[PDB]
Amino acid sequence: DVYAQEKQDFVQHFSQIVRVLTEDEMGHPEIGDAIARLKEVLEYNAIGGKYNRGLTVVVAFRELVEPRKQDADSLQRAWTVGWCVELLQAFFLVADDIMDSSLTRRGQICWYQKPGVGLDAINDANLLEACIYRLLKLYCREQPYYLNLIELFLQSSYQTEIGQTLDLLTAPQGNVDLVRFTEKRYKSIVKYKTAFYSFYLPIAAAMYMAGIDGEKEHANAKKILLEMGEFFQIQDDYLDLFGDPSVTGKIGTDIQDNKCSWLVVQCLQRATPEQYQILKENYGQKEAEKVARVKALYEELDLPAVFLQYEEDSYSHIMALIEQYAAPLPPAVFLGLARKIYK
Amino acid sequence: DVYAQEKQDFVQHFSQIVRVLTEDEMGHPEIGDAIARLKEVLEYNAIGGKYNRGLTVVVAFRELVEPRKQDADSLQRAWTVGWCVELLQAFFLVADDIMDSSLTRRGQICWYQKPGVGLDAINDANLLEACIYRLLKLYCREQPYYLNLIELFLQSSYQTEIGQTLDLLTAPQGNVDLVRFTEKRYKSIVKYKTAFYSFYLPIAAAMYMAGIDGEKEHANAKKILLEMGEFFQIQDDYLDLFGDPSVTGKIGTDIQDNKCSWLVVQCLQRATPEQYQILKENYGQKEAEKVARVKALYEELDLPAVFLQYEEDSYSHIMALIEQYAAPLPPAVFLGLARKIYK
Ligand SMILES: O=C(O)Cc1csc2ccc3ccccc3c12
Ligand SMILES: O=C(O)Cc1csc2ccc3ccccc3c12
Questions:
Q1: Cβ A120–B150 below 8 Å, yes or no?
Q2: CB-based contacts of B21: which residues, under 8 Å, 6+ apart?
Q3: Are A154 and B130 in contact (CB under 8 A)?
């Protein structure tokens, strides 16, 4: 497929990415040990996911830039920017795993949990961030959209950080206070912490590289992409519990982590004073018994049905948004992405 | 004095800095709680130091830009960039205190050690970083040196991070291995982790704002400033032990922290097989008895004398560097700074 076939050339470019970044020890053998540590940080944290966001940069690029203007250097730059996106995500994940004390990521042990790393992962996360800008300078220094990408990456980081701050305030590390789990807060968290960098960033980057720097073009694409981002995260929350581990490829624990999941938000709106106490006394527990009890209150409230209803209405809304805001961009850009997200 | 008088206008501008940054909740009440947290992060971590680096931006600006080209808006921008420097430092300090598990900073409790903060300080540190770029956009978006400052701040961050990585590798959190405490490693650490952002960054920023964007002008200033940075840190290490708490305003613990101090590096070069074992069995201990023992081996090796000798030779070298590389810049720019560092 569009991704399956392109995913190969994208992942293989990583070797060049790492080479070019670890090429600073060239005229500076003094920082050699630091550069080696950097290479270990990159190879462990940037590899191992699905690379969809980075891949979305490359895919969108081919659909926005004319075939002739797609020389070897242009595609080289597109692969790099796509990788910068993955780097931005690695930066967040490494730091987020530390903040929430996670044990594993992608079935693999969290970088900071590795023997000899620990809190040093904080500096490792900052380096992943810095490599984003080192790569842009190395490959797009002479491009007319150089400053655009820099500002875009910086803005995405800030949004994500703001969203993470909001998330940390909403679901503390010891406050099951369901009072703040509102739908307005949930949407705000998803928008800033996930939607902006996951859906807008990748497409916006391809846009700038294609010369589409118009503020209106970006605002129109933003309206569409932020909406897909919200649906993506809502579906992700639903699947985290009612999903099938065989298909998804992972087990959910949002309930055990007192997460401000879409499910809990729905349950809070659809619960009587008695039901509230049931959730207010089961949300955030390692007891498989207390968790299964929660999943029970959800089914009883037919949340899965609500989700199904929301999904259909969501697919309709997004299709309407695409028809209205896609132009002048090729609708395929958004349609191809929506097809991968919606079931 | 030049600083003492200007320090007032600089510190007072902070209120405007915070106002302008916390003005994002304006058209977005949704992220209000996040913006309030941000304001607490800023007011606690950016205030409380001496502000010399930020101040050095303002001072250098007045000496590089003609009096007429110093309108109210130009000085406004200079104060902001100076504050961005302080923000970059706050970002490093907050993150460094967490990484080395410090208890206090500036006599005050480390932000992350505050009740309710903890590892969330990681996200707080990333925000301080982001505010640097938000301020540059807000005040220098239309300036011709905009991209210059962005690249400068990004480069300084990367250097500092690289230097921190090197430092973490050199003096682990449980490896008193004095084998890596060489002078070449010491100089590398100081250059990347301290000199670049502390001495080059501030002056380089004033340079770009003054239109001095020449690569040669910056390379010449870099040679001078990196040298002052090295001396600054060496003197700082010496004072950390042999200094007077009344004058310095703090007690040293580099020996107790197994720091790769200039002193220990000197001691390793000036120690016989028997003396080495003495240090190899006392460096990095909380026992005031074992620490005083170390200070003893230093005095015996007349390190203070060595430092004194190094200081004089250092002042001569730096003066030679200024006479050779200052032009076309006003020598005062470097002389004023050197006068503040050298005793
Ligand atoms: O990354 C995933 O695992 C979801 C996913 C599956 S396929 C796919 C295609 C494009 C994306 C863009 C942004 C975020 C996600 C995705 C995604
Ligand atoms: O910041 C300090 O405490 C040392 C100091 C004393 S006065 C002063 C003036 C300019 C500086 C520039 C960079 C770093 C330090 C300083 C510094």
A1: no
A2: B38, B39, B42, B131, B134, B135
A3: yes
Which residue in B126, B131, B143, B149 has the most chain A C-beta atoms within 10 A of its own C-beta, making it the best mutation to test that interface? B126
Domain with B204, as residue range(s), is 1-343
Number of domains forming the structure of chain B: 1
**Which residues numbered 187-226 in B keep a CB inside 8 Å of some CB on A?**
188, 192
CB B42 within 8 A of CB A175: no
Helix (H, G, I), strand (E, B) or coil at A276: helix
Give the residue from A110, A132, A118, A122 showing the smallest Cα distance to B123: A122
In angstroms, rounded to a whole number, what is the distance separating the alpha carbons of residues A301 and A313? 19
Cα dist from A50 to A4, A81, A135, A341, whole Å: 10, 16, 21, 13
Q: In whole angstroms, how far apart are CA A322 and each of A56, A135, A216, B162, B253? A: 17, 32, 15, 44, 62
Cα–Cα distance between B127 and A165 in angstroms, integer?
9
HSE at residue B328, side-chain half, CA atoms within 13 A, is 11
A89 lines ligand 1 (CB under 6 A): no
C-alpha A238/C-alpha A243 separation (Å) is 7
List the resolution, Å: 2.5
Place of tokens 């460094």: B96
Q: Within 13 Å of residue B217, how many CA atoms lie on the same side as its CB?
A: 17
Closest partner residue to A166 (CB to CB) among B33, B165, B184 is B33
Assigned token pair, B148: 């210059």
Helix (H) or strand (E) holding B132: helix B121-140
Q: Are strands B104-105 and B108-109 parallel, antiparallel or unpaired?
A: antiparallel
Give the technique used to solve this structure: X-ray
The structure tokens 């996951």 sit at: A198
Q: Residue A156 is part of a domain; what is its CATH number?
A: 1.10.600.10
- Give the C-alpha separation, B100 to B168, whole Å: 9
The pairing of beta strand B104-105 with beta strand A108-109: unpaired
CA–CA separation, A243 and A222 (whole Å): 29
Q: Which two tokens stand for residue B9?
A: 């206008």
B167 is catalytic: yes
The answer to whether the annotation marks A53 as part of a ligand binding site is: yes
Q: Is B50 annotated as ligand-binding?
A: yes
Which numbered ligand comes closest to the C-alpha of A338?
1
**Which SS3 state, helix, strand or coil, does residue B141 take?**
coil
Cβ(B235) – ligand 2 distance below 6 Å: no
B147 to A151: CB separation less than 8 angstroms, yes or no: no
DSSP bridge pairs for B109:
B104
